[PDB]
Design a protein around this ligand. Structure first.
Ligand SMILES: CN[C@@H](C)C(=O)N[C@H]1CN(C(=O)c2ccc(N)cc2)c2ccccc2N(Cc2c(OC)ccc3ccccc23)C1=O
Ligand SMILES: [Zn+2]
Length: 82
């Protein structure tokens, strides 16, 4: 194919959801929201990563939305654009 996800295993939303087992208690965004936006937990801090583009996102602020931050930093991501 003409595109390729950075992390094929994390193609699955359920796999992304499971990655949040040890998501920090200070991290306010829900694993549901984050997984839905293509993001899984890297195991470091509040840093997640997109399965598709491989972009990372961390240091989440109140008012942040997963999709909106994904699109702001990584607007040409095929998951964003799909
Ligand atoms: C308010 N909403 C939150 C989600 C937010 O916008 N957080 C910032 C914080 N952030 C960092 O924490 C950061 C990134 C790289 C780095 N060397 C140091 C700090 C960023 C800083 C500058 C540009 C982009 C980011 N990025 C995205 C980002 C990048 O944006 C293109 C690039 C590299 C990144 C590496 C690790 C984590 C994030 C990276 C953020 O997610
Ligand atoms: Zn992406």
């Amino acid at each position: 194919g003409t595109i390729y996800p950075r992390n094929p295993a994390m193609y699955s939303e359920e796999a992304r959801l499971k990655s949040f087992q040890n998501w920090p208690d200070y991290a306010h965004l829900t694993p549901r929201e984050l997984a839905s936006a293509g993001l899984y937990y890297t195991g470091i801090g509040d840093q997640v990563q997109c399965f598709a583009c491989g972009g990372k996102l961390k240091n989440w602020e109140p008012g942040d939305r997963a999709w909106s931050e994904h699109r702001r930093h990584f607007p040409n991501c095929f998951f964003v654009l799909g």
